[PDB]
């Protein structure tokens, strides 16, 4: 009745650590009944490492909590693949990233931001890189009582905002802001540990003489930003200047040097000179320019918006029994974004074709089994499936 096919398939990235570990559930379907092997995505199946990686039974692969010295990347940092084979052929579950992590002494800091009296400011905390993948700001705090809770950009008209990305965006800064500390507070997506920051940053108001001019730090002059659909985000324009600058957001028209001012609304709001947006629609992608200006000078910052969607792969049809030397209607239905390239293969073996519809005009005996599209990309991947019954 059935060739193979995936019911319980492993959501791509899967992370964990010593002091908790993990194990990975892949079970397949068919009506002989698909034998789940676990392999590296490089063809070869996985063995058994005493004290860490070990082939369980009940549709999974267990990574024991491990002595912090039993970490070895060959095990704890690899791409695995549920192999799903029967007598009609085999299929490979999409890239599943094992990432065991040694819990280690982390802590975020809150620096001083140095500001020209009257300008706005954006404080990040910082979260060292190694944990940065699983430690994210969830609060801010005054030395004077106040809390600044994250949001999906609910309110807009006000001195304080926590950006979608967890920085605290002060709309303007009087000197009356230099007596008061701020600490940030991440939380661990794995352990669950809420913890404050080793230090707390003070605001340094610097009163200006006469005038100054707007300019920007190199790592603020060229920004790249990725967000997912229907989620909220913000575009930044980090400039200072006395007197205070005017920020002008324009979107470019695709593949031109002509541009088009960013219209503001209930969806698109600017707390100058930052853009803050909800419902991250897919047209939103593209390139943006922020143009900042005062009586003394000007400046600008390009920014590249890449809104992303949940991509997919499915063939058309999932089962085609042919006739001995026929066509091959092997299209694949879709939605999602971005695709960095779709792939093809048959029975655990990569073939070579890399386009929408697969077709081998003259069928064969060794030309039947399971064929799968692979809609990859840089930070993810989805998969499809098709079997070739015969006449």
Ligand X SMILES: CC(=O)N[C@@H]1[C@@H](O)[C@H](O)[C@@H](CO)O[C@H]1O
243 binds, among a copy of itself, ligand X, none (CB under 5 to 8 A by kind): none
DSSP state, residue 74: H
Complex with a copy of itself: residue 41 or 199, whichever CB lies closer: 199
Site for ligand X (CB under 6 A): how many residues? 14
If one asks whether residue 65 binds ligand X (CB under 6 A), the answer comes out as yes
Q: What character string, x for contact with ligand X (CB under 6 A) and - otherwise, covers 24-63?
A: ----------------------------------------
What separation, in Å, do the N-terminal and C-terminal C-alpha atoms of the chain show?
Answer: 14
Distance CA 262, CA 291 (A): 11
Complex with ligand X: residue 102 or 122, whichever CB lies closer: 102
Pick from 109, 133, 226, 316 the residue near a copy of itself by CB under 8 A: 109
Write out the binding residues for ligand X, residues 271-300 only, by CB under 6 A.
291, 293, 298-300
Complex with ligand X: residue 103 or 304, whichever CB lies closer: 103
C-alpha 82: how far from chain center: 23
Q: What character string, x for contact with a copy of itself (CB under 8 A) and - otherwise, covers 219-238?
A: x-------------------
Q: Determine how β-strand 113-116 pairs with β-strand 201-206.
A: parallel
C-alpha 185: how far from chain center: 22
Q: Angle at the Cα of 270 (from 202 to 171), degrees rounded to 5? A: 20
Q: What are phi and psi of 347, to 5 degrees?
A: 60, 65
Complex with ligand X: residue 31 or 129, whichever CB lies closer: 129
DSSP state, residue 263: P
Name the residue among 317, 323, 350 with its Cα closest to residue 3.
Answer: 317
Distance CA 183, CA 107 (A): 12
Name the residue among 248, 230, 238 with its Cα closest to residue 153.
Answer: 230
248 binds, among a copy of itself, ligand X, none (CB under 5 to 8 A by kind): none
Distances in Å between the Cα of 184 and the Cα atoms of 87, 136, 195 are 57, 10, 9
If one asks whether residue 210 binds a copy of itself (CB under 8 A), the answer comes out as yes
Pick from 37, 103, 122, 204 the residue near a copy of itself by CB under 8 A: 204
What tokens were used for 24?
């990975």
Distance CA 140, CA 158 (A): 16
If one asks whether residue 316 binds a copy of itself (CB under 8 A), the answer comes out as no
Q: What character string, x for contact with ligand X (CB under 6 A) and - otherwise, covers 67-106?
A: xx---------------------------------xx-x-
**Secondary-structure percent of the chain, ordered helix, strand, coil, rounded to 5:** 5, 40, 55
If one asks whether residue 19 binds ligand X (CB under 6 A), the answer comes out as yes
Q: Determine how β-strand 370-375 pairs with β-strand 344-346.
A: antiparallel
DSSP state, residue 198: S
19 binds, among ligand X, a copy of itself, none (CB under 5 to 8 A by kind): ligand X
Complex with ligand X: residue 121 or 216, whichever CB lies closer: 216
If one asks whether residue 222 binds ligand X (CB under 6 A), the answer comes out as no
Using DSSP's 3-state secondary structure scheme, residue 274 falls into: strand
Write out the binding residues for ligand X, residues 101-130 only, by CB under 6 A.
102-103, 105
Pick from 19, 43, 68, 114 the residue near a copy of itself by CB under 8 A: 114
Binding positions for ligand X, rule: CB under 6 A = 18-19, 65-68, 102-103, 105, 291, 293, 298-300
Binding positions for a copy of itself, rule: CB under 8 A = 109, 112, 114, 199, 204, 206, 209-210, 212-213, 217-219
């Amino acid at each position: 009745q059935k060739g193979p096919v995936f019911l319980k398939e492993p959501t791509n990235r899967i992370d964990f650590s010593n002091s908790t570990g993990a194990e990975i559930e892949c079970k397949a379907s068919g009506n002989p009944m698909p034998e789940i092997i676990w392999i590296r995505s490089d063809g070869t199946a996985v063995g058994d490492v005493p004290g860490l990686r070990q082939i369980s039974s009940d549709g999974k692969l267990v990574f024991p909590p491990f002595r912090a010295e039993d970490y070895r990347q060959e095990v704890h940092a690899q791409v695995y693949a549920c192999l799903a084979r029967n007598q009609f052929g085999s299929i490979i579950s999409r890239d599943v990233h094992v990432r065991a992590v040694v819990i280690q002494s982390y802590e975020s800091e809150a620096d001083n931001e140095y500001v020209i009296r009257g300008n706005s400011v954006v404080m990040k905390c910082e979260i060292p890189s190694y944990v940065a993948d699983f430690v994210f700001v969830d609060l801010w705090l005054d030395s004077e009582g106040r809390n600044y809770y994250p949001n999906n950009a609910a309110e807009t008209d006000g001195k304080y905002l926590v950006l979608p990305s967890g920085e605290l965006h002060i709309r303007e800064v009087g000197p009356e802001d230099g007596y008061k500390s701020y600490q940030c507070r991440t939380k661990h997506r794995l352990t669950g540990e809420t913890r404050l920051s080793a230090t707390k940053g003070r605001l340094v108001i610097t009163e200006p003489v006469g005038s100054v001019r707007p300019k920007v730090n190199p790592q603020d002059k060229h920004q790249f930003i990725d967000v997912e659909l229907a989620s909220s985000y913000s575009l930044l324009c980090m400039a200072q200047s006395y007197p205070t600058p005017s920020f002008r957001w324009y979107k470019f028209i695709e593949g031109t040097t002509r541009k088009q001012a960013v219209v503001l609304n209930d969806r698109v709001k600017q707390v100058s000179g930052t853009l803050i947006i909800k419902d991250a629609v897919v047209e939103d992608s593209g390139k943006y320019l922020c143009v900042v200006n005062n009586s003394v000078g000007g400046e600008s910052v390009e920014t590249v918006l890449t809104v992303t969607a949940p991509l997919s792969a499915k063939i058309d049809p999932p089962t085609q029994t042919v006739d001995f030397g026929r066509p091959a209607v092997f299209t694949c239905q879709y939605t999602g974004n971005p695709i960095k390239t779709v792939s093809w293969m048959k029975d655990g073996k990569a073939i070579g074709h890399s386009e929408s519809v697969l077709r081998i005009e003259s069928v064969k005996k060794e030309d039947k089994g399971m064929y799968q599209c692979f809609v990859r990309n840089d930070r993810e991947s989805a998969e499809a499936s098709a079997e070739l019954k015969l006449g």
